């Protein structure tokens, strides 16, 4: 419940650094919100915000992380602008599933606002154990028009569970 | 109101089907099955649908909240499995979503719902529109792999035209 998060990258909306864990409404907010913008003066914009969440389970206790949810809003303006967000959460040393969301403005403005996340268990420490949960989040805007990719902080269900069997 | 499906990896025989509302949600039979053995380095498959929706008299048809269960399995070594799905009103843009896993030295799996919560299509009053859906998977690498998508379900509702703009 009481671990810590490191964020990094050139497109974090909130200043990258080390943050403390705080549970808002049973769900933990990780400050990995992302902001990437492109004008007509450039043919490409890219940005990323990554986090490393170190979780230490108390002795005889287990920490479990599930059900990530991140609100992603893509806006593309004509002509011929593509906006794509890629998100990936995983236990350090393990593989994860990668999700992407993309729109294209051809002749008129286009938008999409969606939640992206994995409903299932994302991480589970050993009893009294420690693990690191990482997350890559990135956006790429390519084309002739203006564009923006905005992601709100990801939220996670993190809960301490009783180790009480074998 | 009817749906036509097409494609080389549709699980159910591509053809013309009539729509029926199961629990207020319509199932489009665009389920996809794509498998790759160790005998080839790549497998690709797709299933697409065209759903023609005609609104009656002074009424409008509204389609929202798509949902498709996608299940990916990848086996080592260095094999990736990817699904891409896109629903959109014909002639308009849609948002494209992808789900992908990569087995390195260990087997990998993921099972997710993929869908758009917001309105996907809205006819004019007494109007006609076509909802299109592309769904496809790619398996790449030396190991075995499988991409399985269950049929898409959709919230389709008739609404009374009783205001004026």
């Amino acid at each position: 419940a009481a671990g810590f998060v490191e964020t990094a990258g050139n497109a974090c909306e909130w200043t990258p650094g080390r943050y403390e864990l705080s549970e808002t409404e049973g769900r933990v907010r990780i400050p990995n919100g992302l902001y990437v913008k492109k004008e007509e003066t450039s043919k490409i914009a890219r940005g990323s915000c990554t986090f490393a969440l170190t979780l230490k389970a108390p002795a005889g206790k287990k920490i479990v992380v599930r059900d990530s949810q991140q609100l992603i809003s893509l806006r593309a303006y004509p002509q011929q602008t593509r906006v794509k967000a890629e998100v990936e959460i995983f236990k350090a040393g393990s593989q994860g599933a990668k999700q992407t969301l993309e729109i294209v403005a051809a002749e008129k403005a286009e938008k999409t606002t969606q939640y992206v996340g994995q409903k299932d268990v994302l991480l589970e420490t050993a009893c009294g154990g420690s693990d690191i949960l990482r997350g890559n989040l990135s956006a790429t805007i390519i084309g002739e028009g203006k564009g923006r990719a905005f992601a709100k902080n990801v939220t996670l269900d993190i809960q301490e569970v009783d180790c009480n069997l074998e």
Side-chain angles (χ1 to χ4, degrees), chain A:
Chain A
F4 60 95
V5 57
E6 303 245 347
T7 62
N10 60 344
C12 302
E13 181 182 13
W14 308 104
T15 294
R18 278 176 64 107
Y19 295 66
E20 296 302 306
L21 283 198
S22 279
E23 180 193 273
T24 55
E25 289 171 356
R27 299 193 45 107
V28 182
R29 288 198 289 259
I30 305 303
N32 73 336
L34 181 127
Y35 182 39
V36 180
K37 176 188 70 110
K38 191 185 83 62
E39 301 267 15
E40 305 195 347
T41 186
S42 187
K43 301 291 176 278
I44 184 173
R46 189 176 144 100
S48 88
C49 195
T50 74
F51 73 88
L53 168 60
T54 310
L55 289 166
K56 304 294 196 164
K61 306 298 297 183
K62 188 194 280 279
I63 290 176
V64 180
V65 179
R66 53 158 57 89
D67 178 42
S68 69
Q69 280 267 101
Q70 178 153 34
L71 190 55
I72 293 181
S73 291
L74 310 180
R75 182 57 161 179
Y77 292 83
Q79 294 181 353
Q80 303 284 67
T81 292
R82 196 178 298 255
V83 182
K84 183 175 174 179
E86 309 176 22
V87 64
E88 189 178 23
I89 285 179
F90 59 96
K91 175 166 81 189
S94 282
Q95 300 289 306
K98 179 175 181 154
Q99 296 172 282
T100 77
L101 175 65
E102 173 186 7
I103 57 178
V104 177
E107 93 280 9
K108 69 183 205 59
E110 300 286 338
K111 50 164 172 264
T112 198
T113 300
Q114 299 204 21
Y115 282 108
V116 179
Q118 309 185 35
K119 176 127 152 181
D120 285 339
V121 166
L122 306 171
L123 179 154
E124 193 192 299
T125 63
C127 288
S130 55
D131 267 299
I132 301 179
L133 190 76
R134 300 209 196 255
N136 306 325
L137 171 66
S138 81
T140 296
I141 307 166
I142 293 172
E144 312 281 303
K146 296 169 166 73
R148 182 178 55 216
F150 187 77
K152 254 79 174 184
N153 297 327
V154 72
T155 56
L156 303 166
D157 179 12
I158 309 191
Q159 271 166 318
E160 278 194 3
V161 70
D162 276 297
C163 293
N164 46 0
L165 185 75
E166 174 198 57

